[PDB]
Amino acid sequence: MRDRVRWRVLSLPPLAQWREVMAALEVGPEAALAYWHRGFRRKEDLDPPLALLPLKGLREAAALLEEALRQGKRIRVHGDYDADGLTGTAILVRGLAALGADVHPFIPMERVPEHLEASDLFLTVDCGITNHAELRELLENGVEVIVTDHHTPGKTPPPGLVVHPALTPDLKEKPTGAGVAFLLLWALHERLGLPPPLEYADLAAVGTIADVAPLWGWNRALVKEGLARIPASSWVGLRLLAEAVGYTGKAVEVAFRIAPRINAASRLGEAEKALRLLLTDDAAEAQALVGELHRLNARRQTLEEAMLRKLLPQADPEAKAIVLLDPEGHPGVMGIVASRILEATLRPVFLVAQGKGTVRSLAPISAVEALRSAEDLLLRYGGHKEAAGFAMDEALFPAFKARVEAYAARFPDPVREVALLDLLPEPGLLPQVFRELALLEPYGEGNPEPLFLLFGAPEEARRLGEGRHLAFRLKGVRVLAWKQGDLALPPEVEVAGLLSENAWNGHLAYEVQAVDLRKPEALEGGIAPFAYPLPLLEALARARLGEGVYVPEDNPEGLDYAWKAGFRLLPPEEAGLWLGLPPRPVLGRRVEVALGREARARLSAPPVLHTPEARLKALVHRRLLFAYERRHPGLFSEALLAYWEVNR
């Protein structure tokens, strides 16, 4: 598990593009790197337009709804029960009610006859993509059907009007159920001559974060609009839930504090509670409902901890697959218990409780493809590569366990990657870099917060507690971390951490929150090697032995000791050993390079005149020294190409 983790330094971009990004966006090289990796290049990519995505079927549904409203038809909004489904349902229910629609909600064939008597138009939120047979509402008695969902569409769309992103050719946005609900309300507003329903973007944003959709393009735009409307929401229940959790406008707070409370209600059978919170305009009742979700959340956490405690100490080792059975375990919390086991384990995880099953997988193992490998054993099932679910008679557990364990063995051990943006800059530059990274927010599925690589010997190390937690400094910057089993740092450490702005007592401190920490190891990254870092003393020996060598015109102080000493001086393109850097590229040259220690060459070590693209050259220089000291051919070679260009 803690041996199947790889650290990769992210590639450097072409310097002409790098500079293009720095200029537009107006930022330094570190932030430009992150921006370039996430695809942001014009000032336009940071604030995409929140516009009406032209989904396929959207206009017809909008027309169909206009008709429903004018003709006073009765509408039933049938939504999914997770946060995305509930916020989407609230969007449509509040939205349509505001326009004089006769509309009510409904949240989960045996119910089809109820839907029939109670409704003229049937609106599904984040569901119904493969509910064909329910074609009776369409057939047997004239009930109009509108389907809005974003779950994997079957081989053929179902009856009634369907509004699905993955059914719109081209289109590369990935709106969720709440997002689609939001677009549909928008389309209806266009038809009626009304302005965009921007006040519903907070509800849309919540659902969007909850369903872990990619935070880019439209999704990114939508969330920025919504995160900002939350503090003064038009929905007192959402504003009150957000304050209860100390919301400060950050997407991470939604994903981890707001949506979980809504989901807890649902997973515990009290989903109407969460829905009502989103629909009431009475603050008193809203206040009370927030207490109720707080109690449901606290309950879900309690059960989740008990289950985790019973299960984690089990079938984990190096078992290709983790298949555990907990008979009396609550079905509503096993999904999160699987994820926590999966993370602490880097192995697919299968849980079964009260005849229901959940799967959390990763790497080359498709969660749903494992289940398929043992499908005749299940009563029902379905999912994707990372998450899947099923029902099964617990009697078939051993058969199931073996099947899926055998299936996972058909693959290589999963390996977790940690993506490094770059070396962390000198402490003096941390503030500006942090402010420049700021425009990347909101962080999330789309774009994760960037990590930096700090490297050195830990000083002023001080524990804070009686284990794990500690603090220390690496080359002038304070780093906080949870020493992963051992405490006491090796003589030298490598850290992958978040650059933090820690407010305390009215003053700010910029330091690193380690997400991972370890004894130096081989780093992934760089381009195809051509320059191989060679230690200075080793290089001078060979030079003295008479090897064909190269010493650049700069620092003729060294080029002198060479003449005096009689080195077989040669031009860089033909000598296989360099004691310094040539001014212009020399490729097609598999060579060995040395800088020194006192070497004038080693003066890629002095600072400059900051602020401008001087900060660029400095990042390149820091890199060269790093790759040189770590004897990393790829990173050195890559850093050397960028060095050639930042000097042209």
From Swiss-Prot:
GO terms assigned for molecular function: DNA binding; exonuclease activity; metal ion binding
Organism of provenance: Thermus thermophilus (strain ATCC 27634 / DSM 579 / HB8)
Subunit structure: Monomer. Intact protein binds ss- but not dsDNA.
Cofactors (names): Mg(2+); Mn(2+); Co(2+)
UniProt KW Manganese keyword: yes
The enzyme's E.C. designation: 3.1.-.-
Biological role: Single-stranded-DNA-specific exonuclease acting in a 5' to 3' direction; has no detectable activity on ssRNA.
One Pfam entry name: RecJ_OB
Cofactor binding note: Requires a divalent cation; Mg(2+) > Mn(2+) > Co(2+). Structures with 1 Mg(2+), or 1 or 2 Mn(2+) were determined; the authors conclude 2 metal ions are required for activity.
Residues noted as binding Mn(2+) 1 in the record, renumbered to the chain: 80, 82, 126
Family: Belongs to the RecJ family.
Keyword Hydrolase: yes
Residues that, per the record, bind Mn(2+) 2: 84, 126, 150, 211
Enzyme class: hydrolase
Keywords for this protein: DNA-binding, Exonuclease, Hydrolase, Manganese, Metal-binding, Nuclease
InterPro entries per record: DDH_dom, DHH_sf, DHHA1_dom, RecJ_C_thermales, RecJ_OB, SSDNA_exonuclease_RecJ
Gene name for this UniProt entry: recJ
UniProt name for this protein: Single-stranded-DNA-specific exonuclease RecJ
